């Protein structure tokens, strides 16, 4: 149960929410018995887990006559949410608001279910430090390494084509065109140039959309590899 | 003055059908009367405006959708992907409806209705509403089908005409 939601919960990609002139990446996991939700800024995690009980009870509070089983609530709930968050630009009417309280933050979601109002509300309470560890920054570190190792890899490939490159040229043939000419690859000056002109844009993370469109499968790769 | 009446199976007695009749005056949104009858006894209720706008502003949705809502489940029309449960309790008198929607149930309408003491009197007037709109309905197909072979008959002609007027 709570377990079972914690996997699904790590083993989520993040997902980009607009809202209210506003940005959040959000990780979801719904089950017949509960949810948990995982809401960041960039400057604060919120973490959020409700049950068979509380959910039953919060959509009573908010919905005065949704007179349904908690089960298919929940159903019905990550129905209406895994669609947006999977694919971003949905035709649906799934808005979103946030309000933040002193510590916590209330993430109301409105929408229409078969042209009827359906409310909910989540009251993610600051995460522990714990899980905004095990879910971003260790994670993130094997992102890291991992595409070192991937340009170490591909700067090796590169020596190797040089080799051969210059084995063609010591045999005396050229080209037949000139314009395909390439320089040889300089794994410092490369590195050095990169650094100088590209990194400023390439390290903009911005409001975290090029973080969820960009590296989410290494993300969850390495999520999975952690998990066991 | 416009009225509509339709059948509905409450759920409470799932082996009968109970006839509900709305009546209104110019247009469903200045308020509706609510006649239900099972064939021995009549329930009256009566929704204005006011209830209506509260309703709506209870549920947090446009009066015109609500409106919408409301006309497409009492006056029966219900499209092909949804449906409706309708239950009256005799001894609270109170009716309400709700729409279910794939093991969710959402409540629609709520009302309380008084029993009348005089069923008979409804129930022969819903008799002669209806005899008097079938006899109508009769009467213009009956006219509309003579006017139909009218013009058919007309029409034959004149394509006679013609064919030879171009064979000519």
């Known amino acids: 149960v709570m377990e079972e939601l914690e996997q699904g919960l790590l083993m989520q990609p993040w997902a980009w929410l607009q809202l209210a002139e506003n940005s959040l990446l959000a990780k979801v996991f719904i089950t017949k018995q509960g949810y948990a939700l995982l ?21 009573k509070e908010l ?25 971003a630009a949905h035709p649906s009417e799934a808005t979103f608001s946030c309000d933040c309280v002193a510590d916590a933050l209330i993430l109301r979601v409105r929408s229409e279910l078969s042209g009827l109002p359906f409310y909910w ?43 051969e490159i210059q084995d063609y040229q010591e045999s005396g043939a050229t080209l037949i065109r000139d314009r395909l000419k390439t320089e040889p690859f300089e794994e410092n000056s490369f590195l050095e140039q990169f650094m100088i002109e590209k990194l400023p844009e390439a390290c903009s993370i911005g409001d975290g959309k090029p973080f969820v469109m960009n590296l989410q499968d290494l993300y969850m790769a390495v999520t999975t590899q952690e998990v066991q | 003055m416009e009225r509509k009446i339709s059948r509905i199976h409450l759920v409470s007695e799932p082996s009968i059908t109970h006839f509900l009749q709305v009546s209104w005056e110019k247009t469903l949104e200045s308020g509706f009367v609510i006649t239900l009858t099972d064939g021995h006894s009549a329930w009256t209720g009566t929704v204005s405006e006011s209830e209506i706008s509260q309703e709506a502003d209870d549920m947090a949705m446009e009066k015109g959708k609500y ?12 499209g092909p992907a949804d449906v409706y449960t309708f239950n009256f309790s005799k001894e609270s008198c109170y009716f309400f409806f709700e729409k279910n929607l794939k093991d969710v149930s959402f409540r629609l309408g709520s009302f309380n209705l008084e029993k009348v003491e005089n069923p008979a ?26 006017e139909n072979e009218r013009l058919l008959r007309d029409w034959n002609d004149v394509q006679g005409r013609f064919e030879k007027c171009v064979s000519a």
């Open chain 1, 39 to 59: 809401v960041s800024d960039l400057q604060q995690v919120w973490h959020e887990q409700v049950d068979t009980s509380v959910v039953s009870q919060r959509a």
């Open chain 1, 63 to 87: 919905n005065k006559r949704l007179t349904a089983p908690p089960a298919a609530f929940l159903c019905h709930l990550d129905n209406l949410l895994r669609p947006l968050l999977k694919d």
């Open chain 1, 121 to 163: 509300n989540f009251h993610c309470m600051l995460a522990s430090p714990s899980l905004v560890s095990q879910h971003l920054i260790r994670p993130l570190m094997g992102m890291s390494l991992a595409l070192q190792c991937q340009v170490r890899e591909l700067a090796t490939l590169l020596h190797m084509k040089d080799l």
């Open chain 2, 67 to 78: 409106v919408g809502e409301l006309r497409k489940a009492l006056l029966s029309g219900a």
């Open chain 2, 121 to 146: 009197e409804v129930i022969r007037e819903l008799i002669c509403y209806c005899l008097d709109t079938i006899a109508e309905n009769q009467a213009k197909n009956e006219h509309l089908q003579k």
